[PDB]
Amino acid sequence: VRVHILGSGGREHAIGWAFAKQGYEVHFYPGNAGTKRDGTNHPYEGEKTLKAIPEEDIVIPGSEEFLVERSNVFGPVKEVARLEGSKVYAKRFMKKYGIRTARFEVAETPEELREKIKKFSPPYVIKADGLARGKGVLILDSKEETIEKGSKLIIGELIKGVKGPVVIDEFLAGNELSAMAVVNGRNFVILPFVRDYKRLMDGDRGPNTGGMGSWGPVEIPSDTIKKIEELFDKTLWGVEKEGYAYRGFLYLGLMLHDGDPYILEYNVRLGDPETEVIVTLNPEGFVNAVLEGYRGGKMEPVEPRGFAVDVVLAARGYPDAPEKGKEITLPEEGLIFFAGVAEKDGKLVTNGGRVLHCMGTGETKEEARRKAYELAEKVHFEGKTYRRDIA
């Protein structure tokens, strides 16, 4: 009867919103002040939190997963999550199981970075082996800046708490694209494709962020989808051949290059703010596929109804230094997913980089767009930061 969601972002709230919408009792760990609408928030305290939860579903989205998965948890074990956790492992995996990816070398020291960089041409891509809070894939025009930053990235002087080998990836001209699936062993369903907005500012300027909005569904050619399906199959076969079974959500960050999809990286959970959009496109179908996947049964396709637009409101300073504690005025209605919000002095206040997700829905992309933006204009807090670019 009960769903337990680990996390505090809009993905988590979106996932909990759908379940609660289908009548399930939803617990968030720790959630945020918005997630109180759709369930009860509890503090997360590691294994103490999880040992207490009976059989019945736990949905993780994060790096919880380089320990969590107890058969309760709908996400892969640590060994499988190395696919996200070690970008080097992921590359060797893909070479092994014939999964189409960019040519690459591994530099474990700055010396190797100097030698091995000579195998590549100007638009250089260096990727930190470990998690960098998605801030450790560098794309640099010049070799000097690549060696200088990439060396520092190896030795832990670039990004505090990141250190160790780097992948040097052959840069791929193309259009970037994500694909996401609910997965049980070798069975999977692909979710609606959504388009995200990674840069902070309109016309894709400013710093990269964890996402400034999205919309969907996006229309992908059937031939492209069949190739995408084949990437999922070969990835899941590879997991089985390593002796493990993938349970949960699998995200492929792709690059369509010369007609073919290449895997830029694996994530072992759904994106934010892609989840907000996907969920809003069919709350029923998402919920069902997750339960069927969790339960070991047949999952039915997740068909999108209409279009969804997510306009993310973030704090002034996001991402490098978001300002907190600012008071949030909300409208009477509207689909909002809450992330960086807290309660303080009986009020709603900002408390994270990305504060709110304002959702618009409609029969067209433009209908969905206006509704989202109409809502974002009704929502206020100081230094309220958003892209009028979306969709």
What is shown here, in short?
With 391 residues, the protein is of the alpha+beta class.
Describe this structure as you would to a colleague.
With 391 residues, the chain is an alpha+beta fold. The protein contains ten helices and 21 strands. It has four domains: 1-77, Rossmann fold; 103-172, Dna Ligase, domain 1 (2-Layer Sandwich), CATH 3.30.1490.20; 173-306, D-amino Acid Aminotransferase, Chain A, domain 1; 307-391, Alpha-Beta Complex (Glycinamide Ribonucleotide Synthetase, Chain A, domain 4), CATH 3.90.600.10. It has helices at residues 10-21, 47-51, 78-85, 87-96, 110-117, 143-155, 222-241, 274-281, 283-295, 365-378, and strands at residues 2-7, 25-30, 40-41, 58-59, 104-107, 124-128, 137-140, 166-169, 175-184, 187-190, 195-196, 199-201, 205-208, 213-216, 247-257, 260-267, 307-314, 336-338, 341-344, 347-350, 354-362. The strands form six sheets. A five-stranded antiparallel sheet has the order 11-14-17-21-18. The protein is 28% helix and 27% strand. It is globular. Helix 3 (78-85) crosses helix 4.
**What would you report as the Rg, rounded to the nearest angstrom?**
21 Å
Query: What is the CATH topology assignment of the largest domain?
Result: D-amino Acid Aminotransferase, Chain A, domain 1
Structural class: alpha+beta
Number of domains: 4
Q: Total helix count? A: 10
GO biological process, one term: purine nucleobase biosynthetic process
GO molecular function, one term: ATP binding
Protein name: Phosphoribosylamine--glycine ligase
Cofactor: Mg(2+); Mn(2+)
